[PDB]
Symmetry: D2
Subunit: 254 residues, 4 copies
């Protein structure tokens, strides 16, 4: 039960956002939810979305994770507006569609470092700031993909970013363990999201999952949300630096 719990959810873009699947679940558990977005234009569509939730007031903040300030300030503000929080969900990442199509060896330096910045570092600084709002401790969860652990056809630069992220988690988990903050990640299966749109051979994989994954099916944002809850809750106390695959156990086969 998540009453008296307040979580920050970063990275909602639409009803298909994975971070939304999470929100639904948390909301359904009576958690007070706070949200962050990148561009203004999103914000309206956003508020439109919230209405499907039993959130008394809508607490929306605009943070683009590339700006040290937008993050530092953004959080401080939340600290002022809602006080302390219990945890953060991090559903943010980016890469140039080019660098995902081209051969990986052709990947550009900007494209590379960019993905590293948004998809991995963001977590570090976010944690550092969120820490300030979790005096008695709390839980942080980030979203990764199997391509962080293996070379996945076409995932290219994003793969390396995820790999980087998955390590980020461990180092954070260690750094903040003492401050009683748990840091874990969810390796999600492929899901039909905004960003999932436009990727080559996506549909192929979804099918290969059904055909090969132990559960012979695919996963959804809710299932992720559920695991997310486990992780954000005291249920997963004692679990830190872990990466949980919510992917029909596709990770376990070969």
């Amino acid at each position: 039960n998540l009453e008296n719990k307040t979580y920050v959810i970063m990275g909602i873009a639409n009803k298909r956002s994975i971070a939304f699947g999470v929100a639904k679940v948390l909301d359904q558990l009576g958690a007070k939810l706070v949200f962050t977005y990148r561009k203004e234009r999103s914000r309206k569509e956003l508020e439109k979305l919230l209405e499907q939730l039993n959130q008394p007031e809508a607490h929306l903040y605009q943070i683009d994770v590339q700006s040290d300030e937008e993050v530092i300030n953004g959080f401080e503000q939340i600290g002022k507006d809602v006080g302390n929080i219990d945890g953060v969900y991090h559903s943010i990442a980016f890469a140039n569609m080019e660098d995902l199509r081209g051969r990986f060896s052709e990947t550009s330096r900007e494209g590379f470092l960019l993905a590293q910045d948004i998809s991995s570092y963001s977590l570090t600084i976010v944690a550092h700031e969120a820490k300030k709002l979790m005096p008695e401790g709390g839980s942080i969860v980030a979203t990764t993909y199997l391509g962080g652990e293996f070379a996945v056809q076409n995932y290219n630069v994003m793969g390396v970013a995820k790999a980087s992220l998955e390590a980020n988690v461990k180092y954070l988990a260690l750094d903040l363990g003492p401050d009683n903050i748990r840091v874990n990640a969810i390796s999600a299966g492929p899901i039909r999201t905004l960003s999932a749109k436009g990727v080559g051979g996506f549909n192929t994989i979804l099918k290969e999952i059904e055909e090969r994954a132990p559960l012979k099916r695919n996963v959804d944002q809710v299932e992720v949300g559920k695991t997310a809850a486990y992780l954000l809750s005291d249920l997963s106390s004692g679990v830190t630096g872990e990466n949980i695959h919510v992917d029909s156990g596709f990770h376990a086969i070969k």
Copy 2:
């Protein structure tokens, strides 16, 4: 919420049993619980224990996992007495204290194969039978230790048994995925159990955990129970073939 859910808990020896830490948690969630023991003499002490739970009736069955029958029959009987179940918790293992003290290379063939039998195979056959009581599917969880993934001083033969077990889980998870049965494992941190008694230097490790583990503390049977619940519940739907470390994130460091 675990009303209308019925789980079989194997491997309770006492109040310090990990499997007991699990039971408490499940009971506290309104699950109907069934138990199994190896020797009669335990059974009394056992009933004595249950009394701390809000279990209407006590359903205790005697199964030594070395006997193909005791298992086949034991389960069938449960099927008759309680009908279908939602899952099974497997907290069973054994190894000869000799083989854990001696150099690993000196390990005897019996000692070796014995541990494999009780600590790993047991799961396989248990799953096969439990399957019959989970028509609409369900969840199976086994308990492993970090020593299944790395050579841990002194864990010796038990290490290899766990390794074996952790693979057992994956192969099972794959085999029974279609039948909608999830199979996962919990890599527990060191806990003061009956069997934990008598192990060389154990106390050293417990301390090293506190000193090195991200959370700078140790874990208990409850924390495991909690994760166990996550895994046994529909919360962990979409998670199969996974090994979750409930160990203060000690698994993540080096």
Copy 3:
């Protein structure tokens, strides 16, 4: 260069044996080679094989790894006949074709424990004895398959055995590190061997390898032999407890 080096090669059944691919390579490096076989009937075919090698004398010993003695004695004898050795190659394993076809959950206890015995334990005892012939230290290598790390369709019980083996290596590596003995394993790609014959969907995999493996091709006994040499030689000094995938990098993808 492998003159003045003497290695024991266990598990040759024919010209297609992986252990043979190894032998060729070692022989080609001037190593003195010793061999072991299970049944008499093999021995003749064996001697027939050796003739393709520049081995002055043929040193063949009969050891079935299920017999504690055949191993203890077998080695002692070698110790008497050839004195000290530099290392051992272990290309032995077994499982019942039944248990590989049936669902994994249906696996029989004998079938299970049998595979564990031959495919994993064998190593332990072999090491213990070979140790006696390597006073200044040496190198031991065993052969595993990817299915020890992931649930591979149909590998079933053999998978778990390999998993067990891969751990055996680590625990041995640790145990004998001080005695300056390195213990490592080769995760080989699928190769057309005697035992490879009769397995379901084998041909499928070989193709999937070519199509998906980074090298877009398959591997042979020689390539393994080559890596084997690296491992058995002082080249791989400082490497112990490692598992090297000679599989066109298939292990690295997903």
Copy 4:
């Protein structure tokens, strides 16, 4: 035997450089060696070093891996001066000593992205260019550390860079498998190098290695070189996307 083989060695700073330990070994095998350095001032000290090798002519090129051009041009030039090559050794990495001392969560964005750039991306672009000099294929090897796989006290940001690198390898290995180029990495144990100087907790670890590592000792640049040779040679044909721990098997314990 490495006659008729030409390899590019990047990242020599002094006689203690790991890349130097490699060079010695390769030179000792009759390989034609090409070198790269970052700053001019190094170059002299460098030529001074070469003299210890049986290299007919010294082929030294200046490439700082942060410049897309210095790399593109640098290689093209080599292509003109020495024609085609057989492979590349990558012994380059950097991170700000600050970010390694501070808590990881405090890591600055520049510091972070910088390490990613030099320590990981560099490989990608280097590969892309070196590819052009390896028409019939070849082998690329990079140097990583255990902290890429686990949170290692103090390794902080460099850890994440290595993690990133280890993924880079896999994705490259896959991308260039078809062009018959193998890409692998060496996870080296701690070694007393120029850069190793100034790290906190260094001497401690070196000792913990001796005390805990299976081989109960430490490793040197040569041992690495040796494995490097295995990897760069046709010996490791069939091995790609692999990470080999040359660390006295410390990786295997816990």
